[PDB]
Design an enzyme around this catalytic site. Structure first.
Site, PDB file in Angstrom:
ATOM      1  N   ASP A   1     100.260  10.172  22.307  1.00 19.79           N
ATOM      2  CA  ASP A   1     100.342  11.229  21.304  1.00 19.79           C
ATOM      3  C   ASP A   1     100.591  10.677  19.909  1.00 19.79           C
ATOM      4  O   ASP A   1     101.294  11.291  19.113  1.00 19.79           O
ATOM      5  CB  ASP A   1     101.401  12.274  21.702  1.00 19.79           C
TER       6      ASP A   1
ATOM      7  N   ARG B   1     102.209  13.298  12.470  1.00 21.91           N
ATOM      8  CA  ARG B   1     103.320  14.224  12.748  1.00 21.91           C
ATOM      9  C   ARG B   1     104.373  13.567  13.644  1.00 21.91           C
ATOM     10  O   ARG B   1     105.522  13.996  13.651  1.00 21.91           O
ATOM     11  CB  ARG B   1     102.816  15.519  13.421  1.00 21.91           C
ATOM     12  N   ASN B   2     103.978  12.526  14.384  1.00 27.97           N
ATOM     13  CA  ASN B   2     104.877  11.855  15.309  1.00 27.97           C
ATOM     14  C   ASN B   2     105.389  10.510  14.807  1.00 27.97           C
ATOM     15  O   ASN B   2     105.712   9.634  15.600  1.00 27.97           O
ATOM     16  CB  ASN B   2     104.208  11.698  16.668  1.00 27.97           C
TER      17      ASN B   2
ATOM     18  N   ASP C   1     108.382  10.751  19.525  1.00 30.06           N
ATOM     19  CA  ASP C   1     107.767  11.715  20.460  1.00 30.06           C
ATOM     20  C   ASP C   1     107.114  11.030  21.643  1.00 30.06           C
ATOM     21  O   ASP C   1     105.907  10.750  21.646  1.00 30.06           O
ATOM     22  CB  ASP C   1     106.771  12.651  19.769  1.00 30.06           C
TER      23      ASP C   1
END
Ligand SMILES: CC(C)(O)CC(=O)NCCn1ccc2ncnc(Nc3ccc(Oc4cccc(C(F)(F)F)c4)c(Cl)c3)c21
Length: 305
Positions: free
Chosen positions: A141, A145-146, A159
């Site tokens: 992932d 955003r992570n 994450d």
């Protein structure tokens, strides 16, 4: 495969104080706070997630599996879990990353982000990802955003909700199916649910493109169901305006259909480092040279060992 001798620290709830709400998600509220280990004259800035009482046995199980992963990793460019607290609902305590996620940070500060920062972040993410490869961890992932921002000069990957430890003999992971970040995924992941370190490389390329466009959404027109045939036809994300061909060719290599033709993280480290030494040769940003960016017993988690 070696024994995992990571320590999981279980914290007493009186040892940490919530100060204000940072955000709230489906599984509970995250607080800014301080961790004050008893008898040590130290205060550590933390983020504290308090799980909801509504949280299912299934959800709880998967959250604890994520904490297991986070407790097992130890690198300056991977998020730092401090411990968990087993109250009515479970609380997770992590290092405070006061500047939030990197996606928001580039969107909000685009007028002040110079080539030096962009290239340094690429290096750092590659370093964290390389370390995760050394650990035989597949992230699954990776995305802007992570990535969290400790300071503008220091980012860390986070994450691990989708992360999978590969077995010793194991080469690829095969998923079961569900809510997937299609626009960040290697073609072989979309098609055959196969995941490797080389598929993390693809995601890394998309993450770089996010950064280089100051937080644009990848394939913004297109719906997710169309993505895989677009890729099969050989189409990729366009060259960001700031990018020299040197930088873009690198992203392009990350999106080869043949997974072994993609660069390795350790090579991405090398290539972005070379560029970080002369950043204005590699990213063309208007006004680049102009730009710069930012009780008592406080210690950062990185210095609390
Ligand atoms: C949700 C959301 C609030 O919408 C998004 C969001 O979590 N972002 C919060 C914003 N945030 C801002 C500075 C900052 N600094 C450090 N950690 C942040 N966030 C953070 C994230 C996850 C944490 O803990 C875990 C560990 C493993 C698994 C889980 C899971 F959500 F699956 F249950 C949570 C903690 Cl303690 C904090 C920060």
């Amino acid at each position: 495969h070696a024994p995992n001798q990571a320590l999981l620290r279980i914290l007493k709830e009186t040892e940490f104080k919530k100060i204000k709400v940072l955000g709230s998600g489906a599984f509970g509220t995250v607080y800014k706070g301080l961790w004050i280990p008893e008898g040590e004259k130290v205060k550590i800035p933390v983020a504290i997630k308090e799980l909801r009482e509504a949280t299912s046995p299934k959800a709880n199980k998967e959250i604890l599996d994520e904490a297991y992963v986070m407790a097992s990793v130890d690198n300056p460019h991977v998020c730092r879990l401090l411990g968990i607290c087993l109250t009515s609902t479970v609380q997770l305590i992590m290092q405070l990353m006061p500047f939030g996620c990197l996606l928001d940070y580039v969107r909000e500060h685009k007028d002040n982000i110079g080539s030096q920062y962009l290239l340094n972040w690429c290096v750092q993410i590659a370093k964290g990802m390389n370390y995760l490869e050394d650990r035989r961890l597949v992230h699954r992932d990776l995305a802007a955003r992570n990535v969290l921002v400790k300071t503008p000069q220091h980012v860390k990957i986070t994450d691990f909700g989708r992360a999978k430890l590969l077995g010793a003999e194991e080469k690829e992971y095969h998923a079961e199916g569900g809510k997937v970040p299609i626009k960040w995924m290697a073609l072989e992941s979309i098609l055959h649910r196969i995941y490797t370190h080389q598929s993390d490389v693809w995601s890394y390329g998309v993450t770089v493109w996010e950064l280089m466009t100051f937080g644009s959404k990848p394939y913004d027109g297109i719906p997710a169901s169309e993505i895989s045939s677009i890729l099969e036809k050989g189409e990729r994300l366009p060259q960001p305006p700031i990018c020299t061909i040197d930088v873009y060719m690198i992203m392009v290599k990350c999106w080869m259909i043949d997974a072994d033709s993609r660069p390795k993280f350790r090579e991405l480290i090398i290539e972005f480092s070379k560029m970080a030494r002369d950043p204005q040769r590699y990213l063309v940003i208007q006004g680049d040279e102009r730009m710069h960016l930012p009780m008592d017993d406080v210690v950062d988690a990185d210095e609390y060992l």
